[PDB]
Assembly symmetry: D5
Homo-oligomer: 83 residues x 10
C-alpha cells in the first residue's frame, strides 16, 4: 500500500516491460535466420528494430526514476575496467 | 537449425500474433494502473506501435499459406450474429 | 467494457490461434487420412473463429486504424 | 509412436484442449455484460463443443475402446 | 453451477486424460510385464473414470446435442 | 541397464500424479453442493487411492529398499 | 477445509516434494561419476527416503486409509 | 552459436534476469522494517543495477544497433 | 561436463533443499498439532543439514570461495 | 509475520535466485567463445557469488541455527 503511485509501482512494472521487449527482440533475432523468404525477413527486421527502440525507450525511462542512474553512467568506465 | 515452408514458418507467425496481442493487453493494463504522465506517454506510444506489429503479422498470415477468405465474410457474419 | 471485455477477447484470439497451431502440429505428425481430414475441418473452423474475434475487436472501442493501413504496409514492401 | 505413444495420446490432449477452450469461453460469458461479445462467445463455444464431440468420436473408434463409455451410464445410475 | 462445478468437471476430464496419457507413455518405455500389466489395469480404470466424467458433464450443464450428432458429423467425411 | 531412472523414478512420478489427482478431486468435493458430483467424485477418488496404493506396492518391490517403511511405526510413536 | 484441505493436502504435497527431491538427487547420481557427489548425494537420498516414509505414515493417520495400502501387498501378486 | 543465436539473444536474456532480480529486491525493500537487511538489500540491488547497465552497454557494443541511444532521448521528449 | 553438468546441478540440489525448508516451515505454521509439528521441524532440520552439506560440497568444487573469507567483514563493513 | 515467512523465507528464495543467476551465467560460459562476453560474464558471476555469500550469512547470522553450517565440514568428512 505505501506506494507514492509514481515513485515505486510502475518502476517494477516498467522493468517488466523492458524484459518483455527484450524477449520479443530475442524471438525476432532467432527468426531472422530461420527462413529464405526475403520480404518476411525484411518485415521481421523492421519490427525487430522497432521493438529494439521500444527497449531503449523503456530503459531510458527506467534510469531516470528513484533507482540509480549513476550506475548506467558508470557503465562505460566499468566496461573497459576489466583489465 | 531448422527450415520449413509450412509449419516452421506459419506456426511461428501465428505465435507472433499472440505475442503482439499479449504485449497489447499488458500495455493496456499498464495504462490503467498508474497516474504517471511520462510513463503513460511512452506506454501508449509503444502500445500503438505494437498494434502495427500485430496488424502486420496478421497480413503476414494473410499473404501466407493461410486464407484471407476468412476475413472477407467476417464483417457480415458478425452482423449475421444479430 | 475494458479488460473485462477487451483483454478477454484478445485472450480468446490467442486461444483460437493456439488451437490452430496445435491441430496443425497434429496434422503434420501423421500421414493418415481420417484424422488428417477431420483435423483439417476443425482447423478451418478454428481459423474462422480467430477471424471472427478479430472483426469483433475491430468493431469494439479500440483503434483498428492499424488494420486499415495494414493493407498498405503489406504492399509497401515490394 | 504414430499410433501407440503418439497419435492417441495426442488426440486425448486435443480433447483436453477443446475442454479448456470451452471452459474459458463459459467463464467469459458471465464476466462481461456486452451483447455482441456475448453472442460471438456463445457462437464460438457452440462450435468448440462440436469440435470436442467429434474428437470424442475419433478416440472412441481409435486405439482406445468405446466399450468403457457404454458400461458407464449404468454406473452413473448408482446415484438413486 | 458454472465454472465452479461444470467447468471443474471438464477439468477432471482433462486430468483423467492426462493420467491415461502418462501411464501409456510409461507402458511404451519398457518390456517388464508386471509393471505393464498393473499400468494397463490402472489405465483401463482411468478410462472408465474419464467416460463417467464425460457423461456427467453432458448432464450437468452444457448441451450434449453435439454428442448426439457426433456420429452424424463423423460420417460426412468417410 | 536402466530399471532405475527408467523404471523406478517413473513410478515415483506416477505416485505423484495419483496423489495430485486425489488432492484435486478432494478440492472438487469441497467446492460445490451437488449429490451426483459427490457420488462420482467419491467413487473416482477412492479408485484413484487404490491406484496410488497399487503404484506404491509396485515401487516397493521394483528398486528402493523399504527399510524405512518397516521401521517407521516407531518414529511416529516416539512422542505422544 | 482445514483438517481435510489444509492438513491433508499439505502432507500429500509434502510427499510429492520429497519424491521430487529424491528424483533430482537420483538423476544427479547417474549424471556424473564423482565420488564426493556420489557419496553425499546417496546420503541425502537416504535421508529424503526417510522423510518420504515418515510423511507416508503421517497420511496413514489422516484421510487416506490403509484399507487399500494393506490390500496392496495382497493385490500386487494377483495382477500378473 | 557464439555471435548471433547464442550471443545477442542470451545477453538480452541476462539483462532480463538482472532486471527481475532488481524488481525482486525492490519488493523485499518494501516488505520489511529491518535496517541491516534493508542496507544489504539496497546494496545488492544497486549491484544488480550495475550489472544491468554493463550488459546494456555490451549489447550496444555488440552486433545490435546503438542508434537508439542517439534517438530515444529525442523521441521521448516528443511524447507530449 | 564437469562445470555446468555438475556444479549447476549441485546449486540446483541446494535450491531444492531451500524450497523444502520453506515449504516445510509453511506447513509447520498452518496447524496446532504437535506430532506433525515436531517431526516436520525435525525433517526441516535435516533439510538444513542437507543444504549445509551441499554448500560445503560446492565450496570444495569449481566456484570461488574468496567471498567467504572477506564476507564476514563486508557484512559488517556496512556501519 | 515481518520475521517468519515475510523475512526468512524471502531470504531462502533470494539465495535460490542468486544460485540461479550464477547457474545461468555458467550455462552461458559453455555457449560461446567470445572474450568480451567472457570478461563481463566472469565479472557479473563473481559479483553474484558475493551476493549469495552475503545472503547466506544474513540467513546464518539470524535466529535459525548455523550449527549445521558449523558441523558441516565434519559431517561431509564422515561421508567416505
Ligand atoms: Fe514493443
Ligand atoms: Fe511485440
Ligand atoms: Fe474455437
Ligand atoms: Fe483417475
Ligand atoms: Fe488416476
Ligand atoms: Fe533432503
Ligand atoms: Fe526433506
Amino acid at each position: 500500500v505505501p506506494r507514492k503511485m509514481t515513485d515505486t509501482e510502475l518502476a517494477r512494472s516498467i522493468r517488466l516491460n523492458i524484459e518483455a521487449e527484450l524477449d520479443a527482440i530475442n524471438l525476432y533475432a532467432a527468426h531472422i535466420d530461420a527462413t529464405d523468404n526475403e520480404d518476411a525477413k525484411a518485415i521481421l527486421q523492421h519490427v525487430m528494430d522497432e521493438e529494439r527502440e521500444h527497449a531503449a525507450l523503456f530503459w531510458e525511462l527506467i534510469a531516470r526514476l528513484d533507482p540509480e542512474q549513476a550506475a548506467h553512467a558508470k557503465e562505460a568506465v566499468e566496461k573497459y575496467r576489466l583489465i
